[PDB]
């Protein structure tokens, strides 16, 4: 990953970034006109990765994004069959349904540096599929809700 | 050696990239997506409280757990007319709030 | 910005303008994509388009 | 139409029916015909009940 954009303190990057949302990345989009506004993170620690866990803010890296475009690929198909497919997929019974591969509710509970922990309130527990448990380092896990993580 | 010191063996295991799994099944198998339980009327018709306790190997630095509750996260995309998209989301056991 | 509440994928129709993307801060789509790739395709190979 | 006209599992195709039997027959035939080069079949979800 580091050699893809070269060596040197400064560099110019030409990257392609995909869509990872489960309900969008596989969606077969029907004819129309849609706004596709997205926001790209500019936090240096989250964008970049180093072998050492050095703080890239204090080290000083920055990223200067100049131009952002998206490239759509359209399968060239006969307009008759394309219209037939569009009419078939505009129907209620032909709705496209997608699933998130890691279909789960991630709940990270803090752990003081010893001992054991604790659990949840009442609920329905219908269509439950199981638990998946693993410990992370608090220093390595960033905040989620805030656009930026000062800590 | 012909003159050792002594043995006192100790064992450990090191798996690093796997999430521990406790499948929500009666036989712990996975014989289908929607498990044997969950369809169980006890866990579908009534609300039940849950309590989990973890005993761990202590480490000095402050760390945190990460339980991923395996659920059904499905989205249905419906496009009735030109240029209109209606998508309905449903996470079944943990719905929104 | 995938699962942050302050930024969303407002992707929607031009006329009705109702969002087709909602994120509720409990989904982990980054790990979802990672595990999806690792399970669908062998990933000992390196791809230039997406790292 | 999510909780009223249909049950939620059947509406979201969690436990209702297979794609080949809840899609339109024309759409199923089209997906089979164009599976070689366009592969519609990804976009639809099967219940896989235990």
């Amino acid at each position: 990953r580091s050699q893809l954009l070269g060596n040197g303190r400064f560099c110019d990057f030409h990257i392609q970034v995909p869509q990872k949302f489960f309900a969008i990345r596989n969606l077969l989009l029907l004819p129309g006109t849609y706004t596709y506004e997205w926001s790209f993170r500019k936090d240096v620690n989250m964008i970049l990765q180093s072998t050492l866990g050095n703080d890239l803010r204090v080290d000083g890296a920055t990223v200067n994004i100049t131009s952002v475009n998206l490239y759509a690929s359209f399968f060239p198909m006969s307009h008759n069959t394309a219209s037939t497919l569009e009419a078939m997929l505009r129907n209620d019974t032909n709705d496209q349904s997608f699933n998130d591969y890691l279909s789960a509710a991630n709940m990270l509970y803090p752990i003081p540096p010893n001992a054991t922990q604790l659990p949840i309130p009442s609920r329905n527990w219908a269509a439950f599929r199981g638990w998946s448990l693993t410990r992370l380092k608090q220093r390595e896990t960033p905040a989620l809700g805030s656009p930026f993580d000062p800590y | 050696d012909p003159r050792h010191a002594l043995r006192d063996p100790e064992r450990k295991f090191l798996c690093d990239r796997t999430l521990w799994r406790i499948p929500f099944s009666s036989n712990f198998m996975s014989m289908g997506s929607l498990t044997d339980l969950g369809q169980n009327l006890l866990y579908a018709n009534a609300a039940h409280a849950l309590d989990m306790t973890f005993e761990m190997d202590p480490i000095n630095e402050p760390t945190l757990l990460y339980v991923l509750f395996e659920v059904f996260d499905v989205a249905r995309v419906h496009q009735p007319h030109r240029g209109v998209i209606e998508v309905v989301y449903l996470r079944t056991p943990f719905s929104a709030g | 910005y995938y699962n942050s509440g302050g930024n969303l994928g407002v992707l929607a129709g031009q006329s009705s303008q109702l969002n087709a993307v909602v994120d509720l801060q409990d989904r982990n789509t980054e790990l979802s994509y990672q595990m999806l790739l690792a399970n669908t395709t062998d990933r000992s190979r390196y791809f230039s388009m997406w790292n | 139409a999510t909780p009223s006209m249909l049950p939620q599992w059947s509406y979201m195709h969690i436990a209702g029916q297979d794609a080949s039997e809840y899609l339109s027959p024309g759409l199923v035939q089209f997906a089979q015909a164009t599976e070689s080069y366009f592969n519609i079949g990804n976009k639809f979800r099967n219940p896989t009940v235990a």
Binding site: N99, Y101, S103, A104 | R21 | - | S20, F44, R45
Partner: peptide
């Protein structure tokens, strides 16, 4: 045809 793959 359809798909039914996810974690678990």
């Amino acid at each position: 045809l359809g798909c039914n793959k996810m974690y678990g």
